[PDB]
From a paper:
The mammalian family of secreted phospholipase A2 (sPLA2), which are Ca2+ dependent, low-molecular weight and disulfide-rich enzymes, plays key roles in many physiological functions and pathological processes by catalyzing the hydrolysis of phospholipids at the sn-2 position. GIIE, the closest homolog to GIIA, is regarded as a “hair follicular”, “inflammatory” and “metabolic” sPLA2. Similar to hGIIA, hGIIE has seven disulfide bonds.
Two are apo-hGIIE structures at the resolution of 2.0 Å and 1.9 Å, with different crystallization conditions: without (apo-hGIIE_1) or with calcium (apo-hGIIE_2). In the apo-hGIIE_1 structure, crystallized in the condition without calcium, the Ca1 is surprisingly not fully occupied, with only 54% occupancy in this typical calcium binding site. In the apo-hGIIE_1 structure, Ca1 is only 54% occupied and the occupancy for Ca2 is 57%. This raises a possibility that calcium in the second binding site could move to the first calcium binding site when needed. Therefore, hGIIE may have a cost-effective way to use calcium, and Ca2 can act as backup to support the partially occupied Ca1.
Numbering used by the authors: 3 to 123
Write the structure that this text describes.
């Protein structure tokens, strides 16, 4: 919902165009990322992992944000909510930055096609 709103504001695409992209976007992730957008998702998964190790529940946290001409501003009552926002912001910025190589063929990519090693965080 929130991450999804952020993705839409930053990329011009519906949130559904990222939610099962490549090997990393959406739940889980293994093998080698298909492209730069998928690397965004690999880094996002790593970011959430760091937050879980800090005591946060980033898959559940809800935060506040705005998008102005100046960028994305994150907020929230708790530090865990602000951290979750920051992980999402990095990923949404990374998606935007890689719009040029986004490929519709990797949307809803069947994870059975994912091959190669799993890069470490
Ligand atoms: Ca993932
Ligand atoms: Ca996929
Ligand atoms: Cl960091
Ligand atoms: Cl979580
Ligand atoms: Cl920003
Ligand atoms: Cl911020
Ligand atoms: Cl709250
Ligand atoms: Cl906290
Ligand atoms: Cl395309
Ligand atoms: Cl598109």
């Amino acid at each position: 919902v929130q991450f999804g709103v952020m993705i839409e504001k930053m990329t011009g695409k519906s949130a559904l165009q990222y939610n099962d992209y490549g090997c990393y976007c959406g739940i889980g992730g293994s093998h080698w990322p298909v492209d730069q957008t998928d690397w965004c998702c690999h880094a996002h998964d790593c970011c959430y992992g760091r937050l879980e190790k800090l005591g946060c529940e980033p898959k559940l946290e809800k935060y506040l944000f705005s998008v102005s001409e100046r960028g994305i501003f994150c907020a929230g009552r708790t530090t865990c909510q602000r951290l979750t926002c920051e992980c999402d912001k990095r990923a949404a910025l990374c998606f935007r930055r890689n719009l040029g190589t986004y490929n519709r063929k990797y949307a809803h990519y069947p994870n059975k096609l994912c091959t190669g090693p799993t890069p470490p965080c």
